[PDB]
Amino acid sequence: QNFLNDQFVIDSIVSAINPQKGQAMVEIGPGLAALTEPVGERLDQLTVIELDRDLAARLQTHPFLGPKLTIYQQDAMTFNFGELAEKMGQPLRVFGNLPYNISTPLMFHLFSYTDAIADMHFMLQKEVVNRLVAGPNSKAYGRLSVMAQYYCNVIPVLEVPPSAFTPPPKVDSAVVRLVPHATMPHPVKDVRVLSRITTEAFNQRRKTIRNSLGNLFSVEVLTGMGIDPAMRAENISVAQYCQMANYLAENA
């Protein structure tokens, strides 16, 4: 719905993405081709996922983009990216102006394909980008920071005012780059457990982890790991959360 319309902003995003011939790029929500056109001009082929049948039909008749485009008229939420990576024969460079509504579930959907994604460049609500990148001991640090950082290097790109879109959104936007780790810095036996620990910790972020994770870790276990039970969810590092996930897997 909120179509990117500012030319300078557009140029700045294209410059950041830096599409190169030979890369397999996939846009989620090409819309009115604000990014599709300039990105596609640098490529021989380009894949898009577009739910609006009206706008998809306009891409197909673009004289230069058309011949280059593979258009999937489906929902990205349940799109099999892992299978698309197999077809393109290489990890995917994903990009797009994402609707605020689906942005967080889509990111987790993409994260689950690990290896299959080279990188991601998404427009999101600015506060979402701040959480994604946040480190411990700050307000923005939460479960999303930890999960997102387990999977990826999180790289803020641009902040974008409402006036850059037509119609304008109600809140500031930002572009973030997400790069799945080539080498996972803190591997976890089973991610569902990491997901569970962070949910429990952050659902009670104004309590010490002694209290919020007391159903899962004794004070002795926490002390043994070098984790201070007087600390709260937001004081615990990504590394420590992963150490807790592995413990709970190697011991329960």
UniProtKB/Swiss-Prot annotation:
A GO MF term: 16S rRNA (adenine(1518)-N(6)/adenine(1519)-N(6))-dimethyltransferase activity
Protein EC: 2.1.1.182
Q: In its UniProt record, which GO terms are filed under biological process?
A: maturation of SSU-rRNA; response to antibiotic; ribosomal small subunit assembly; rRNA base methylation; rRNA methylation; rRNA processing
Alphabetized, the UniProt keywords read:
Antibiotic resistance, Cytoplasm, Methyltransferase, RNA-binding, rRNA processing, S-adenosyl-L-methionine, Transferase
Q: State the phenotype upon gene disruption.
A: Inactivation leads to kasugamycin resistance. Cells lacking this gene show cold-sensitivity phenotype, altered ribosome profiles, and small subunit rRNA-processing defects.
Localization, UniProt: Cytoplasm
Question: Which residues make up the binding site for S-adenosyl-L-methionine?
Answer: 2, 4, 29, 50, 75, 97
InterPro entries found in the cross-reference section: KsgA/Erm, rRNA_Ade_diMease-like_C, rRNA_Ade_Mease_Trfase_CS, rRNA_Ade_methylase_Trfase_N, rRNA_adenine_dimethylase, SAM-dependent_MTases_sf
Q: Which reaction does it catalyse?
A: adenosine(1518)/adenosine(1519) in 16S rRNA + 4 S-adenosyl-L-methionine = N(6)-dimethyladenosine(1518)/N(6)-dimethyladenosine(1519) in 16S rRNA + 4 S-adenosyl-L-homocysteine + 4 H(+)
Q: Which Pfam families match?
A: RrnaAD
Q: Indicate the enzyme's highest-level EC class.
A: transferase
In its keyword annotation, does this UniProt entry include Lipid biosynthesis? no
Cell membrane is among the record's keywords: no
Which HAMAP family does this entry report, sorted A to Z? 16SrRNA_methyltr_A
Q: Which family does it belong to?
A: Belongs to the class I-like SAM-binding methyltransferase superfamily. rRNA adenine N(6)-methyltransferase family. RsmA subfamily.
Q: What does this protein do?
A: Specifically dimethylates two adjacent adenosines (A1518 and A1519) in the loop of a conserved hairpin near the 3'-end of 16S rRNA in the 30S particle. May play a critical role in biogenesis of 30S subunits. Also has a DNA glycosylase/AP lyase activity that removes C mispaired with oxidized T from DNA, and may play a role in protection of DNA against oxidative stress.
Query: Mind telling me what this protein is named?
Result: Ribosomal RNA small subunit methyltransferase A
Q: Which organism is it from?
A: Escherichia coli (strain K12)
Encoding gene per record = rsmA
